[PDB]
Structures are given as C-alpha cells and as structure tokens.
C-alpha cells in the first residue's frame, strides 16, 4: 500500500566467464528490475565487480538521474576474474555510505548476480558477511547458469545471502532466464518495504 524508503544495490559480476550476449541480458534485467522496484522513495546504486571494481552510479548519482535504463545501458563490460567477497565489502563501504547518498533509517538491500565461484580473491566471505550483517544489509543473491549445479556450488549462494538463505538464493540455468525470477524478486523486496 504504502513503501518505506529503501536504499536498494546491485553487485554484479563482470567476469569474462560471461560472454557479451550475456553481459547485456543482465543489463537488460537490471534495468527492468530497477524500474519495476521504483517508488518515490526508492534509490538505487550500482557497483560492478570483476578483479577491478567500478560504481556506475551512487544513490546520490541516482538521486539527480533517477532513471534506471538511462544509467545501466552504457555499461561497460570490465572482463577478468571474480572477486565476489571484496565486491559485497565495497558495497557495504562505498555504496551504503552517507557521502555517497545513502540514507540513515532506510532499508539497505543488495542484490548480488554471479556467473561463478568466488577466485583471485583475497577476501574470504567470512571477513566480509558479518560486517554486511552489522550494516544491516539484506542480500538476494542470483546465481546464474551451470557454475551453481553441485551442493558444494550453491553452498557459496548460502554464505552470500541473509538468513534464511532459501528465501534469498536464486538460481537460473542462463542469463535469458534472469526474467523468470523479476516477479518473485520484486514481490520479496516489496514484502520488506510495503506497508498496509
Ligand atoms: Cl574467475
């Protein structure tokens, strides 16, 4: 009925794991997710991450251009290897950061697409989740394609997620298949932000 200011993150992966096809299909789904997500008091903010990291945008930056499609399209695809551990934790310095735009009081949510195990990093997940869980972050994750098929493969989708992890893991066989998952995605952001 009524949604609660939300700063609300995307983290995703520019690996060259993922083919240009691809990279501009997971462009395509941010871009329809952030426009579906948006509400008055709603910013959005953007990081991608490879072995380099770059903010395509701050919520402040949104904040000044609030128009999704206009700041994911141009994007560059950065290429080289997956360091998805540094990734959440520059996230949780950089994006959830009062200079940068965002909110105190407001829900921090990230969403984090990976196209592979985490490798090259010299994070651990275990120095980078608990301090997302002190910053209050709550994190969907999206596992995206045949990296995610094994137990020991989804168990590195758990250790990225909030608790319960069942409710906040995704997993989709090819990056086409992102689309399959908007509905449930925005349905999960708007149970968290949606007041009657
Ligand atoms: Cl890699």
Known sequence: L?????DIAFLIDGSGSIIPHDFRR???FVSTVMEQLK???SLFSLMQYSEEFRIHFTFKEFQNNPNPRSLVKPITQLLGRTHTATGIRKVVRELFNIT???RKNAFKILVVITDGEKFGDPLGYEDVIPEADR???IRYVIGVGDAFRSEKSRQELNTIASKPPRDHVFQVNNFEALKTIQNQLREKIFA???EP
């Open 2 to 6: 009524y949604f609660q200011s939300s």
């Open 192 to 194: 968290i932000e949606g």
């Open 100 to 102: 940068n735009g965002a």
């Open 135 to 137: 910053e209050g972050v």
């Open 39 to 41: 509400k008055s008091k």
């Open 26 to 28: 997971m462009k395509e």
